[PDB]
Amino acid sequence: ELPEDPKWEFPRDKLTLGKPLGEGAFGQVVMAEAVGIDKDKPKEAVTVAVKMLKDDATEKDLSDLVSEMEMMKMIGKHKNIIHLLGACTQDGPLYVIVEYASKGNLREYLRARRPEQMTFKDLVSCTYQLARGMEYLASQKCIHRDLAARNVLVTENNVMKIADFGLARDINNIDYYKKTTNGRLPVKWMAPEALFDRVYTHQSDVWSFGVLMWEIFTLGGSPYPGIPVEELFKLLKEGHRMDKPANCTNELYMMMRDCWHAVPSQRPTFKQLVEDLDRILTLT
């Protein structure tokens, strides 16, 4: 059923599943103890996160979990991306072992720290880290397609980790102009071209990053508040764009607006966002 990949395979007998961390779209995540997952420490038990199918899993759920694992293999390691640690794929259920982020997704993290409150600098830092994570991802020819605060995890060290690669794809593994393309992307975080033209590029992720930025500076606010999903794209075409967040600087808001530029090629690249953000952070 599943091809061997020795380099990533982890022995089932050295993994001990713990309490669940939450049920998701196509899978379940549980806390776990993995012995020797760090090959330099063969006897150390490391706390990890394990993603597996739910009891009511579908064939497509498995296909998605497999695909998510493969994406994480090809992406590599980076400070601001949740990292793949190994997997149990031979004779037995599929387990995707990834690093554990003790503080949950960014949205929850931020909503809980609404007046250890968050400082302006903290917010710019979170943003900078995520921009840096996306710059790396883009250079790996990978489009995330599901960028959002709920899909960012925060470690014990408050390090931002881009996660949830269930919809991620290689830039060339997209079926352009097909009526079903991008059909499973959350609408309020989606670039307009993703639906109107049925394409997806790094510039599409940049639009999503803009929405992420708005979530960050609203401390976990809900995008397009009061506007139903059904009438969003009509408003987007007409030029509607979310208003500027209070904890936000005019400059940072202009950056969000640039990310929400109608023309894909007129939006900044992740390379540029990192540069401007590094500058702003350094000033702050």
Judged by the rule CB under 6 A, the positions of this chain that interact with ligand ACP are 21-22, 24-25, 27, 29, 49, 82, 98-101, 104-105, 153, 163-164
By a kind-dependent CB cut-off of 5 to 8 A, residue 195 interacts, out of ligand ACP, its own copies, none, with its own copies
Contact assessment for residue 232 and residue 207, using Cβ atoms and an 8 Å cutoff: no
Contact assessment for residue 71 and residue 81, using Cβ atoms and an 8 Å cutoff: no
In the bound state with its own copies, the residue whose beta carbon lies nearer, of 94 and 126, is 94
In the bound state with ligand ACP, the residue whose beta carbon lies nearer, of 101 and 248, is 101
In the bound state with its own copies, the residue whose beta carbon lies nearer, of 19 and 39, is 19
User: Could you say which of 64, 146, 164, 205 is catalytic?
Assistant: 146
Six-digit token string for 260: 């929400």
Q: 176-205 mask for its own copies (x: CB under 8 A)? A: ------xxxxxxxx-----x----------
Q: Are strands 28-35 and 45-52 parallel, antiparallel or unpaired?
A: antiparallel
> Assign residue 36 a region: left if phi > 0, alpha if psi is -120 to 50, beta otherwise?
left
Hey, which residues does 95 pair with through a beta bridge? Answer: 88
Stretch that binds its own copies, among 10-18, 77-85, 156-164, 222-230 (CB under 8 A): 222-230
Stretch that binds its own copies, among 42-50, 74-82, 90-98, 158-166 (CB under 8 A): 90-98
Six-digit token string for 59: 């064939």
We find the least distance from the C-beta atom of residue 222 to its own copies, in angstroms, to be 6
Hey, which residues does 60 pair with through a beta bridge? Answer: none
Six-digit token string for 168: 């991620």
Burial class from Cβ neighbours inside 10 Å (0-12, 13-18, 19+) for residue 131 reads buried
Q: 134-153 mask for its own copies (x: CB under 8 A)? A: --------------x-x---
**C-alpha–C-alpha distance, residues 215 and 21, integer Å:** 23
Catalytically active residues are 146
The binding site for its own copies (CB under 8 A) comprises: 1, 53, 55-60, 62-63, 92-94, 148, 150, 182-189, 195, 222-223, 228-231
